[PDB]
Amino acid sequence: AQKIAVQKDVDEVVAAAQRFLHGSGNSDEAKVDLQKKASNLVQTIRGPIPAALSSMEDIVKVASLRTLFEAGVFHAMPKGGASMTASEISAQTGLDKGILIRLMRAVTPLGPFHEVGEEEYAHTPFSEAYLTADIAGCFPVMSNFIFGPVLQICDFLRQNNWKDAITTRNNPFTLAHNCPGETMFEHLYKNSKNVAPVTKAEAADVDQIAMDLYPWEERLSDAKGSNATLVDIAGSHGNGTRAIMALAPKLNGCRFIVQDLEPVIGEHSQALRAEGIEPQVYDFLKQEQPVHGASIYYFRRVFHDWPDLPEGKKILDNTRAAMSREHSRILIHDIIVPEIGATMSHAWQDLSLMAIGGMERTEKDFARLLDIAGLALVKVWRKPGDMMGIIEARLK
Amino acid sequence: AQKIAVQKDVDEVVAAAQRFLHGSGNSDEAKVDLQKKASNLVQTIRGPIPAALSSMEDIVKVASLRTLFEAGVFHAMPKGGASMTASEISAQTGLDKGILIRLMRAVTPLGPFHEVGEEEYAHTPFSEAYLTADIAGCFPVMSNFIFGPVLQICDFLRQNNWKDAITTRNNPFTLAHNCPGETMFEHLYKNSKNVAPVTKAEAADVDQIAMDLYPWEERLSDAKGSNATLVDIAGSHGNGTRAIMALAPKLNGCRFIVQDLEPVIGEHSQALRAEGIEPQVYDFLKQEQPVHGASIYYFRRVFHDWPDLPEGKKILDNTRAAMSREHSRILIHDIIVPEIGATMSHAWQDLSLMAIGGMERTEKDFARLLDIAGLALVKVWRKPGDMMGIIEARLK
Ligand SMILES: C=CC(C)(C)[C@@]12C=C(OC)C(=O)N3/C(=C/c4c[nH]cn4)C(=O)N[C@]31N(OC)c1ccccc12
Ligand SMILES: C=CC(C)(C)[C@@]12C=C(OC)C(=O)N3/C(=C/c4c[nH]cn4)C(=O)N[C@]31N(OC)c1ccccc12
Ligand SMILES: Nc1ncnc2c1ncn2[C@@H]1O[C@H](CSCC[C@H](N)C(=O)O)[C@@H](O)[C@H]1O
Ligand SMILES: Nc1ncnc2c1ncn2[C@@H]1O[C@H](CSCC[C@H](N)C(=O)O)[C@@H](O)[C@H]1O
């Protein structure tokens, strides 16, 4: 039968595991191949037609995780694998015991929970992972505000006959949230009860961005006086700055600045001052870059929020204003998408940004963004196996 | 490292494959265990926190499949694995080449397509499966009308503080489609351009429902005159009737009836008459069962659309009207959900029905539906490994 196909796919899984289990630390390519072959084996087991039903399984699973997390089922359940009944869970959260039982059927068969017995469930480390800092900031915001729009990508493109009408202020997010005209940050910050959850999600860093990719000690110490300064534009929480103060520590009493919109600077001002950095409110769309002539202006996970034109050039030009030609420099820190062999990690970030008019850029895409803004490529800082790179640039 | 955990999970995959590859045909339990262990291996490879990002990967993948299918990318691409470029695809569909490239990143790394080279893609049998009858009827309707509501299950339950306010006419479907008051069939049939796609999706039968589970030859041949009759209520296309005429063929010139709402009977009337069955319009909510005293009244994949009360009892009572006490009989054909060990196949059907006020029932749930409508359990017809059973019932 097809039992032949299962057998060949199991062989490839074993072969890939053996490769992965004897490679060194050189996020490996072996690790992703083993995932790939594991995935093939499932699909082959299911067969082509039944595997096309995995979109409906996937959708209800996400919908059930989102509901269970929002209704406090994850927090009500004993961390550590101890069991708890539907009735107990229903009592402590007020989620209808009938809905809860139905919802649990999507997150126990394979899902991150364990069905210990009838109406009886336990955490596993995969469910409890939804409680960690990274996931707990990131998942509720994505599921309450972003998943809906992403699903509506098709509807938005349909209205323009599959043409790219997508903009920062007219996109599947404005369509789904019925807010044409507002960018996503505008719409979320407008309601103050979103500021805490959104700034937490902005702190999410599941893949642990490599901040030692660039020599902060070198460029910042050869900086006399006013050039000994680093601006972390749309710095948000500041963790990127903390990590740069944590990647060169022999400081010549240096100036460390974190600019962001008002409600963000509000949330982190006290904690940023405390750690000795200075919080200033700034809008790289309306205003020009206040701090003149700093050795670097640093952009981490900002430019994937914006298209080349208009906002892209407007960012780069509003801060070209304050740059010394020969002594200031611009650093763009973002995913660098390969032109072939992209992973699901590129895909989910890029396509979620599609819903708000953003986009992850290839190396060629960054080249055109520089050209359009009259900037010279200095160096593309990559430590391969990193998805992030740093685009270093000076004024032409 | 964790390399220990990968190794133990690979061993369980191999062990489960060996079990599956030496079992007989007794939809196996071995087949699902091997899927389970394959799934564990992926999750272990990724580690708990990064695996919690698979909700965002899953959402963009569904969103990208839906867009690519709706924009005709599946139909433009050479069936059989021959490659085609982004530009070629973009030319034949009018989908923006830039959107297309971005979208393809979600369906090539593991997705059902193959990235042959830069901007170059091929079908596989897993992508082409989206073109078969079953998937092509079922997937567009689910993705255009159902996925949205399912994601909004959380929003709906939130409005009532996680309490079950869900009804046939007030539910995540009415919330998402802004149509409070209308049931789902009402809302979709209201626009006539939905009738063809929805009736096709109603014909979907990916898991191939077992129609030989019940002895049609026996009960229908011991039927004299007016009792030699079968009513396929909400029969829709008729395939269930065709299969009953295709599971007993020594007919005493018998009467085969397919009742459904008007726009459905319209689509299938000509093709139903041709095959010698009679199409009559009937609404098991408004009217009483016209055809009196038939040996069976047959319900396939209807009752999971409706709650016990109100519509559930109203169905069973509107057709109790036409039943002979001792010679008519009721057959309910639906998934029978186990109280433990449900699969993702139960879960996606039950939780998608949640969005419209429907539900898949356990054996105990069917017991209460009978009690509430004054019907006696005759026999629960199950051939285990079938997810469907038949609930046989007579008037108490
Ligand atoms: C919703 C959360 C925010 C606002 C923060 C987010 C913005 C980001 O750009 C500035 C970002 O980097 N994000 C995430 C990074 C992450 C999480 N774990 C590991 N890396 C993330 O979850 N969501 C996002 N992201 O995705 C690329 C988004 C996609 C569509 C709208 C908004 C966003
Ligand atoms: C959208 C398609 C319809 C209207 C037909 C559908 C109705 C069904 O009940 C009468 C049904 O049986 N369905 C399917 C069966 C199937 C497909 N492949 C293998 N079995 C299916 O895809 N969708 C549904 N279903 O799911 C249980 C639904 C869930 C929420 C709303 C509407 C439905
Ligand atoms: N018009 C604007 N001017 C300045 N900052 C803006 C802005 N619009 C959005 N931002 C900020 O850009 C940030 C992007 S997410 C945080 C990025 C941060 N540097 C990090 O890598 O973790 C948000 O905190 C948001 O408030
Ligand atoms: N009020 C109503 N009265 C009668 N039929 C209805 C109805 N509301 C919905 N239906 C029908 O019930 C059917 C359910 S799906 C088709 C089921 C079919 N017996 C099969 O197993 O393939 C739909 O075709 C729908 O039109």
Q: DSSP letters along A82-140, please?
A: --EEHHHHHHHH---HHHHHHHHTTTSSSSSSEEEETTEEE--HHHHGGGSHHHHHHHH
Q: What are phi and psi of B168, to 5 degrees?
A: -55, -30
Instruction: Spell out the residues 6+ positions from residue A354 whose beta carbon is closer than 8 angstroms to its own.
Output: A150, A153, A166, A171, A172, B99, B102
Whether residue B48 has a cis bond before it, omega within 30° of 0: no
User: Tokens 């601006």 map to which residue?
Assistant: A231
Length of chain A: 396
| Residue A20 to residue B6, Cβ atoms within 8 A | yes
The SS3 call for residue A384 is: strand
CB B104 within 8 Å of CB A342: no
Tokens 């890939």, located at residue: A16
User: Is A346 tagged catalytic?
Assistant: no
In terms of Cα–Cα distance, which of A12, A9, A22, A36 is closest to A341?
A36
Residue A331 burial (10 A CB sphere; 0-12, 13-18, 19+): buried
Q: Which of B41, B340, B351 sits opposite A115 (nearest CB)?
A: B340
Stretch (H or E) spanning A53: none
How many residues does this entry show for chain B? 396
Distance of CA A168 from the midpoint of ligand 1 (Å): 15
Rounded CA-CA distance A330/A393 in Å is 5
Give Dmax over CA atoms of chain B in angstroms. Answer: 76
H or E segment and range at residue A360: none
Ligand 1 centre from A272 Cα, in Å? Answer: 22
Under 8 Å between Cβ of A295 and A227: yes
Q: Give the separation between CA A330 and CA A334, rounded to whole angstroms.
A: 13
CATH-assigned architecture of domain A216-347+354-395? 3-Layer(aba) Sandwich (3.40)
Cite the active site residues of B.
304
- Dist CA B172 CA A145 (whole Å): 16
CB contact under 8 A, A109 and B31: no
Are the C-beta atoms of A121 and A77 separated by less than 8 Å?
yes
**CA–CA distance from B16 to each of A275, B13, B33, B262 (Å)?**
54, 5, 7, 50
Do A135 and B351 make contact, defined as CB atoms within 8 angstroms? no
Question: 3-state SS of chain B?
Answer: CCHHHHHHHHHHHHHHHHHHCCCCCCCCHHHHHHHHHHHHHHHHHHCHHHHCCHHHHHHHHHHHHHHHHHCCHHHHCCCCCCCEEHHHHHHHHCCCHHHHHHHHCCCCCCCCCEEEECCEEECCHHHHHHHCHHHHHHHHHHHHHHHHHHHCHHHHHHHCCCCCCCECCECHHHHHCCCCCCCHHHHHHHCHHHHHHHHHHHHCCCCCCCCCCCCHHHHHHCCCHHHCEEEEECCCCCHHHHHHCCCCCCCCCCEEEEEECHHHHHHHHHHHHHCCCEEEECCCCCCCCCCCCCCEEEEECCHHHCCHHHHHHHHHHHHHCCCCCCCCCEEEEEEEECCCCCCHHHHHHHHHHHCCCCCCEEHHHHHHHHHHCCEEEEEEECCECECEEEEEEEEC
E strand intervals along A111-246: 114-117, 120-122, 229-233
- Documented resolution in Å: 2.5
User: Which residue among A168, A183, A188, A236 has the greatest number of ligand 3 atoms within 8 angstroms of its CB, and so is best to mutate?
Assistant: A236
Q: Is B86 on the interface with A (CB under 8 A)?
A: no
Query: In this structure, how many other beta carbons lie within 10 angstroms of the beta carbon of residue A163?
Result: 12
Q: Which of A193, A276, A202 is nearest to A235 (CA)?
A: A202
DSSP state of A363: H
- Give the CA dihedral B41, B45, B50, B55, nearest 10 degrees: -30
Within 10 angstroms of residue B304's Cβ, the number of other Cβ atoms is 17
Give yes or no for B253 touching A (CB within 8 A).
no
Strand pairing category for B388-395 and B375-381:
antiparallel
Name the DSSP class of A227.
G
Residue A28 annotated in ligand binding: no
In single-letter form, the type of residue at position B351 comes to: L
H or E segment and range at residue A259: strand A255-260
Name the residue type at position B352.
Answer: S
Q: Is A19 annotated as a binding residue?
A: no
Q: Are domains B54-130 and B216-395 of this chain identical in fold?
A: no
Using a 6 Å CB cutoff, which residues line ligand 4? B 185, 202, 234-236, 240, 260-261, 264, 282-285, 300-302
Cis geometry, peptide bond prior to residue B197 (ω within 30 degrees of 0): no
Q: How far apart are CA B106 and CA B119, in angstroms?
A: 13
Distance CA A365, CA A184 (A): 23
Is any Cβ of chain A less than 8 angstroms from the Cβ of B30? no
Superfamily of domain B216-395: Vaccinia Virus protein VP39 (3.40.50.150)
Rounded to a whole number of angstroms, the CA Rg of chain A reads 24
Among residues B129, B329, B44, the alpha carbon closest in space to that of A17 is found at B44
> In this structure, are residues A169 and A180 in contact, taking their beta carbons and an 8 Å threshold?
yes
User: By three-state DSSP, how is residue A362 classified?
Assistant: strand
> Is residue B301 part of an annotated ligand binding site?
yes
CA distances to A40, A129, A151 from B357, rounded to whole Å, are: 35, 32, 22
Any idea where the domains of chain A sit in the sequence? 3-51, 54-130, 132-202, 216-347+354-395
Rg (CA), chain B: 24
Structure tokens belonging to residue A395: 């004024």
Provide the token pair at B302.
């209807």
Interface of A with B in 59-78 (CB under 8 A): 59-67, 70-71
Residue A386 annotated as binding site: no
Contact between B6 and A38 (Cβ < 8 Å): no
Closest CA to A220 of A189, A253, A193: A253
Gap between the Cα atoms of B101 and B96, Å rounded: 9
Asked if residue A316 lies in contact with residue A373, where contact means CB atoms within 8 angstroms, the answer is yes
- Rounded to whole angstroms, how far apart are CA atoms A158 and B71? 8
The separation between CA B220 and the C-alpha centre of its own chain, rounded to angstroms, equals 28
Q: CB distance B55–A62 less than 8 Å?
A: yes
Is B70 exposed, middle or buried, given 0-12, 13-18 or 19+ CB atoms closer than 10 A?
Answer: buried
Which of 32-51 (B) contact A at CB < 8 A?
A: 34-36, 38-39, 41-43, 45-46, 48-51
Strands A296-300 and A330-337, how do they pair? parallel
Please tell me the class of the B54-130 domain: mainly alpha
Q: Say how many Å lie between the CA of residue A305 and the centre of ligand 1.
A: 9
Ligand closest to Cα of B232 equals: 4
CA B179 to chain centre: 23
